[PDB]
Amino acid sequence: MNTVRWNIAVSPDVDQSVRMFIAAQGGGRKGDLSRFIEDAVRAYLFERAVE
Amino acid sequence: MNTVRWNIAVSPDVDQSVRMFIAAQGGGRKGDLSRFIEDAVRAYLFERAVE
Numbered sequence: 001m002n003t004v005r006w007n008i009a010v011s012p013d014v015d016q017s018v019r020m021f022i023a024a025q026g027g028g029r030k031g032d033l034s035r036f037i038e039d040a041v042r043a044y045l046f047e048r049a050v051e
Numbered sequence: 052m053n054t055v056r057w058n059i060a061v062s063p064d065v066d067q068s069v070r071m072f073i074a075a076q077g078g079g080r081k082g083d084l085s086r087f088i089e090d091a092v093r094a095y096l097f098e099r100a101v102e
Contacts, residue, residue, distance in 0.1 A: 008085035
């Protein structure tokens with residue numbers, strides 16, 4: 001019941017692309033960038049889970 | 052020419068799944084977890100880029 005603190009370094013090209021995706025889909029979502037990657041990793045881990 | 056510092060919080064269930072994927076594919080890779088998500092976001096941003 002406690003969120004974990006993730007620390008990762010990436011190229012500034014990745015951050016700009018992340019904001020670009022939301023800007024095309026809106027620009028004022030509730031969650032933040034942390035949620036965008038969190039849901040992305042969940043879908044990949046599950047897909048490889050089946051096989 | 053300077054890596055960016057990413058700060059994101061996720062459920063401890065995501066970290067365990069990340070290490071599980073590499074353990075099944077090996078267990079001693081060069082890069083670290085930061086590279087696993089970096090390449091994941093690059094593939095998604097490009098796919099939506101075409102359309």
